[PDB]
Design a protein around this ligand. Structure first.
Ligand SMILES: *[C@@H]1O[C@H](CO[C@H]2O[C@@H](C)[C@@H](O)[C@@H](O)[C@@H]2O)[C@@H](O[C@@H]2O[C@H](CO)[C@@H](O)[C@H](O)[C@H]2NC(C)=O)[C@H](O)[C@H]1NC(C)=O
Ligand SMILES: *[C@H]1O[C@H](CO[C@H]2O[C@@H](C)[C@@H](O)[C@@H](O)[C@@H]2O)[C@@H](O[C@@H]2O[C@H](CO)[C@@H](O)[C@H](O)[C@H]2NC(C)=O)[C@H](O)[C@H]1NC(C)=O
Ligand SMILES: *[C@@H]1O[C@H](CO)[C@@H](O[C@@H]2O[C@H](CO)[C@@H](O)[C@H](O)[C@H]2NC(C)=O)[C@H](O)[C@H]1NC(C)=O
Ligand SMILES: *[C@@H]1O[C@H](CO)[C@@H](O[C@H]2O[C@H](CO)[C@@H](O)[C@H](O)[C@H]2NC(C)=O)[C@H](O)[C@H]1NC(C)=O
Ligand SMILES: O=S(=O)(NC[C@@H]1CCCN(Cc2ccccc2)C1)c1ccc2ccccc2c1
Ligand SMILES: O=S(=O)(NC[C@@H]1CCCN(Cc2ccccc2)C1)c1ccc2ccccc2c1
Ligand SMILES: *[C@@H]1O[C@H](COC2O[C@@H](C)[C@@H](O)[C@@H](O)[C@@H]2O)[C@@H](O)[C@H](O)[C@H]1NC(C)=O
Ligand SMILES: *[C@@H]1O[C@H](CO[C@@H]2O[C@@H](C)[C@@H](O)[C@@H](O)[C@@H]2O)[C@@H](O)[C@H](O)[C@H]1NC(C)=O
Ligand SMILES: *[C@@H]1O[C@H](CO)[C@@H](O)[C@H](O)[C@H]1NC(C)=O
Ligand SMILES: *[C@@H]1O[C@H](CO)[C@@H](O)[C@H](O)[C@H]1NC(C)=O
Ligand SMILES: *[C@@H]1O[C@H](CO)[C@@H](O)[C@H](O)[C@H]1NC(C)=O
Ligand SMILES: *[C@@H]1O[C@H](CO)[C@@H](O)[C@H](O)[C@H]1NC(C)=O
Ligand SMILES: *[C@@H]1O[C@H](CO)[C@@H](O)[C@H](O)[C@H]1NC(C)=O
Ligand SMILES: *[C@@H]1O[C@H](CO)[C@@H](O)[C@H](O)[C@H]1NC(C)=O
Ligand SMILES: *[C@H]1O[C@H](CO)[C@@H](O)[C@H](O)[C@H]1NC(C)=O
Ligand SMILES: *[C@H]1O[C@H](CO)[C@@H](O)[C@H](O)[C@H]1NC(C)=O
Ligand SMILES: *[C@H]1O[C@H](CO)[C@@H](O)[C@H](O)[C@H]1NC(C)=O
Ligand SMILES: [Cl-]
Ligand SMILES: [Cl-]
Lengths: 527, 525
């Protein structure tokens, strides 16, 4: 029988057969009191103690969230939708342990993305059994509250203070500290990693003093807090709180009556109004996300970064080749996943209106001018690819590069990567390229499974990335082997070297998309 | 089998070597691990252990950056560490003839690696052949490299400089207090080393605290007066502060700088070592020996001219093509994968990379002196000139100058010029007889006939092996009847012995016309 004694009680797991070995899995451990009833919109309350044995043998409920139904039946969009029932009672975590039990294993803690409005740790692409099996690491992941239930903010009011989903994540890290030894893991060797809004969350744990003792190192995939979508100003968030009140007939004279009113709405009545709190949004709108709450964040994060007030540790950062393409088929004119989306100069100008709704006509012209110095005038694909790059540079690449620059300037080793391989099984069309989110399956080792019809090159790439990630967690250095391997050098703000990841050649290069990023850092803010 | 050292018992291993047996002790600890509060400090003497230490595997190599310019390539990876890296690395190895001798001369090897890399467990430093064929006891030790071994704030015991030099000194101390228990003679000990190991050896000649720890010295392709060998206290101060800024460790206080640096991950020290110098070259020594006021009481060249050093017999030499290895770590037009033919303009660009602070006039004068072609048709003329510039300035001419001055104090000195290119050499033919590729002949590797060496290579390696062990035992590098006698190097005739498979001649005034530039004109540009 598979039983571990946690400080809240005993849990029962399951045995999994992975590559002729075993992985012990405990799926669905609770780490907090369910945020029901009067605990709606409050920080997670710590768990008590049960006397039974909790049966951690299935994934648990996913937190309440709207679903993406833009392409019914499409594996492309549906692989991100929740694969367990939805409920407000969702504060559960999973643990994958290598067999035979380790004695001081390094722990990798995954934090999913989803614009802070969607996501769940139970998705097939976040399956930590391969990492446990192949690299002997413990893998942990948690469900955290998304949308208004996760990030509604009346700043300074404990009834709805903001950043609750981030405190959710933080509590799960507290659990790993208190309990992971009992499973064989070293609480002094804990590496957070996440993707997109999960990576933005990981960068915010670097800034937040209450997290500093809960992990060792950070891995940020396709996101950072200084991305234009990741943080809301303190008073833009309280404004959206009040318009959600109005949208459900909860406008009141004092804030705590507002909250008491919101607490008796049914989740669906809240999720049904979340889109409407922003006047005019883009496909990258975060309706309810991290804010300056005075608690988890004591200042706008760009200030803390500049002043050097953050955890001093090693980081691993990178981005994908085609971050922007996914968002074009969610609101730009002339774009479909089912045709090759050749657009015109004026469709391109309408695209920019979709993604830059508040920008002047001169600013939209300067973006267009910077992105139309074609190598070949036709190339019908010019304007289609230009728009993908505008979205991808402004929203993911240039901020990740800026964060790594500023962070490395205070003396810790930083490593940067450019992921360039398109998955051979990728359900989206070819013109969308190396999309946002489609390195995750390679980070978790899914191509190591041969019955799954990936290419042998893809198994070798995924085997490499798994090794480099797990070595970075263990040693602070994303090396593969000492010989017959390209050295991944540290990213310093002068040379700015990064490693490229694909099947043909891993190369050291420098100054990734510097001529694009110079626009967003040095011209666009002045517009 | 087991031996009792003054601090506990160690257990060894049997090696079967050329029909006989060699008894090996690999990975004996000789100092406390320089960890935690001991990082950057001198080595702390060890205290007795009650168990039995098992010196049966090579130990951890000291933290160091790894040459990964050529992933897969044997010619560079054979210098990379072949045990795990760790700050816990002050171990040494001992190889003993079988059956046990009772008063064997000891040969102590100090490896090179520009003071930044290296380890005693490399295959080309395997001491079992020397013990088997000549009945000498061979020792080698790991010492700290890079900033972890040579970070200097002069006068502060928390980071004084030369810590890696004192590592070597503590290992020499262990041999004085323990080699007799193994069957060795502490009164017959010869240091030998290559490149930075050779420079290390020559500094042990100058440092009075090492005076009593050895008898004689062998210096392969290096000496302390080489331009890359010693950092000024000025340079060391600029580089320690630069490492502080690069790690986030700038403080207003020296001791706060070091308390911050003791908290850094070793990789955060290693991976910043490269940026502490603005104008680096492929021969840059980021953190090397300094005048610390302890190991070195004064500037080495002063101690040399005044005669303030251990008086004894020394054996010194260089290889024919010392410079070529460095040409593929920076110079333009050079590759291990093509014949590296270059033009006069590319030659001028190589000079820029090797001499970044030299005036345009001085770089012109380097050019002129090295372009008096015997045959001005050969397209490889400039390729050869540049390797000869680097080799003469950095290794050959400093070694000749060192041997001249050392000899003028009544000491018997012997100089050699090694010209054999190994038949197995992984690097292209144009690099010739490279830096570091006499070592495998000195350690007896070609004596193993299941190894793709040539017959001539076995015979050449057997005489070098014999001559070296003879210099250790008797103070004179003699050999067998049919064997050229090796005459003493003296300032006026300047005789040296040539080493190759064809014929070993006696010649005079090695490369005198090249070196006249580096001693008598270059110092004035
Ligand atoms: C003594 O150190 C200073 C500081 O130098 C920089 O070197 C960088 C590569 C990097 O490692 C960084 O940590 C450090 O700041 C040297 O100063 C510089 O000199 C060059 C001229 O060659 C100028 O171009 C730089 O602007 C200047 N930088 C600063 C900050 O002053 C200086 O050269 C060095 N001197 C010696 C003799 O080593
Ligand atoms: C061991 O290593 C090479 C691969 O080294 C390439 O591996 C990359 C991950 C990267 O680190 C890079 O620096 C390194 O050079 C092995 O090579 C490859 O071998 C497979 C078959 O096993 C071929 O299908 C590939 O085309 C080939 N890629 C190359 C050569 O770039 C190789 O087997 C081995 N090399 C040696 C010298 O032992
Ligand atoms: C990757 O590089 C790291 C260096 O950062 C290697 O780390 C040492 O690893 C061993 C385990 O084999 C430890 O016992 C040492 O203490 C580590 N030392 C340091 C300074 O980190 C690691 O072994 C390398 N891994 C591979 C597969 O090459
Ligand atoms: C697991 O590994 C840790 C180190 O990461 C061990 O902790 C030791 O080192 C700590 C450094 O942070 C110090 O607190 C102590 O020297 C030591 N901690 C102790 C003895 O509790 C930890 O012991 C390991 N646990 C094992 C091997 O079971
Ligand atoms: O809460 S979200 O609305 N999630 C819904 C998304 C809409 C964008 C496409 N997909 C995800 C996706 C991923 C890959 C490939 C196909 C589809 C569904 C949201 C909102 C802002 C973000 C801002 C940044 C990143 C993610 C964000 C997610
Ligand atoms: O240890 S190093 O830091 N590494 C750079 C070297 C460049 C020389 C080629 N190799 C080693 C090598 C050896 C032989 C033949 C092929 C290759 C790697 C270093 C740094 C300064 C030096 C200065 C002087 C001498 C040696 C030095 C070594
Ligand atoms: C805050 O937001 C206000 C938005 O008002 C709106 O009405 C609500 C109900 C929603 O449906 C939104 O779509 C509407 O835009 C702004 O009117 C106000 O100026 C903002 N700022 C401040 C400082 O109040
Ligand atoms: C959890 O399940 C318990 C039953 O264990 C069951 O019996 C054991 C031996 C295994 O076979 C297991 O797979 C079976 O499901 C119940 O007795 C217990 O009440 C359950 N606990 C809770 C909290 O529901
Ligand atoms: C779990 O796996 C272990 C080790 O592989 C095995 O000994 C045991 O029988 C399994 N227990 C189950 C399936 O309950
Ligand atoms: C040393 O190795 C021997 C090999 O025979 C082993 O028996 C012994 O347990 C080891 N002792 C140690 C590590 O103290
Ligand atoms: C060798 O060892 C003996 C051991 O008694 C010692 O007396 C002698 O001085 C040593 N020296 C030499 C040069 O052999
Ligand atoms: C160095 O500065 C620290 C800062 O408080 C101080 O405690 C220490 O005594 C200082 N030491 C010297 C020698 O100035
Ligand atoms: C040798 O190779 C290097 C790098 O590949 C190149 O720059 C150089 O021009 C080549 N030289 C010749 C003669 O082919
Ligand atoms: C000698 O060469 C052969 C192939 O040519 C190789 O297999 C063998 O291992 C080599 N010898 C040694 C000692 O490596
Ligand atoms: C493809 O996408 C939509 C299909 O509804 C359409 O508006 C767009 O113009 C189409 N483009 C083509 C077919 O090139
Ligand atoms: C070396 O090893 C054995 C094993 O202990 C030792 O007794 C003997 O002196 C040597 N001889 C052989 C054949 O190993
Ligand atoms: C060389 O070794 C010693 C030292 O001079 C001497 O006794 C011996 O006879 C010499 N042998 C030859 C062959 O020169
Ligand atoms: Cl996502
Ligand atoms: Cl060397």
């Amino acid at each position: 029988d598979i039983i571990i004694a946690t400080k809240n009680g005993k849990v029962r797991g399951m045995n999994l057969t992975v590559f002729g070995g075993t992985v012990t899995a405990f799926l669905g451990i609770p780490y907090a009191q369910p945020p029901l009833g009067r605990l709606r919109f409050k920080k997670p309350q710590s768990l008590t103690k049960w006397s039974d044995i909790w049966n951690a043998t299935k994934y648990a409920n996913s937190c309440c969230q709207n679903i993406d139904q833009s392409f019914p039946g499409f594996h492309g969009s549906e692989m991100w939708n929740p694969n367990t029932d939805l409920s407000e009672d969702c504060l559960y975590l999973n643990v994958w342990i290598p067999a035979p039990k380790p004695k001081n294993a390094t722990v990798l803690i995954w934090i999913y993305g989803g614009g802070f409005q969607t996501g769940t740790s139970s998705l097939h692409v976040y399956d930590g059994k391969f990492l446990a099996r192949v690299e002997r690491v413990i893998v942990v992941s948690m469900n955290y509250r998304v949308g208004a239930l996760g990030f509604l903010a009346l700043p300074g009011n404990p009834e709805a203070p903001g950043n609750m989903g981030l405190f959710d994540q933080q509590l799960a890290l507290q659990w790993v500290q208190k309990n992971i030894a009992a499973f064989g893991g070293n609480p002094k060797s804990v590496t957070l990693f996440g993707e997109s809004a999960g990576a933005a969350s990981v960068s915010l744990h670097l800034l937040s003093p209450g997290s500093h003792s809960l992990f060792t190192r950070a891995i940020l995939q396709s996101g950072s807090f200084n991305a234009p979508w990741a943080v809301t100003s303190l008073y833009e968030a309280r404004n959206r709180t009040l318009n959600l009140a109005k949208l459900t007939g909860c406008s009141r004279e004092n804030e705590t009556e507002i909250i008491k009113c919101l607490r008796n709405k049914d989740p669906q009545e809240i999720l049904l109004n979340e889109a409407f709190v922003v006047p005019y949004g883009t496909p990258l709108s975060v309706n309810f996300g991290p804010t300056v709450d005075g608690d988890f964040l004591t200042d706008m994060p760009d200030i803390l970064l500049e002043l050097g007030q953050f955890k001093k540790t090693q980081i691993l950062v990178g981005v994908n080749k085609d971050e922007g393409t996914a968002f074009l088929v969610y609101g730009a004119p002339g774009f479909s996943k089912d045709n090759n989306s050749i657009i015109t100069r004026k469709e391109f100008q309408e695209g920019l209106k979709i993604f830059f709704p508040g920008v002047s006509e001169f600013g939209k012209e300067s973006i267009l001018f910077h992105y139309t110095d074609w190598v070949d005038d036709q190339r019908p694909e010019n304007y289609r690819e230009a728009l993908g790059d505008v979205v991808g540079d402004y929203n993911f690449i240039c901020p990740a590069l800026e964060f790594t620059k500023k962070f490395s300037e205070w003396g810790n080793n930083a490593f940067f990567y450019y992921f360039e391989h398109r998955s051979s099984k990728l359900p989206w069309p070819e013109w969308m390229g190396v999309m946002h989110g489609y390195e995750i399956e390679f980070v978790f080792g899914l191509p190591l499974e041969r019955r799954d019809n990936y290419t042998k090159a893809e198994e070798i790439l995924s085997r490499s990335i798994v090794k480099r990630w797990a070595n970075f967690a263990k040693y602070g250095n994303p090396n593969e082997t000492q010989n017959n391997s390209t050295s991944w050098p540290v990213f310093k703000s002068t040379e700015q070297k990064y490693l490229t990841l694909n099947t043909e050649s891993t190369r050291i290069m420098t100054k990734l998309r510097a001529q694009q990023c110079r626009f967003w850092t040095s011209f666009f803010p002045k517009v």
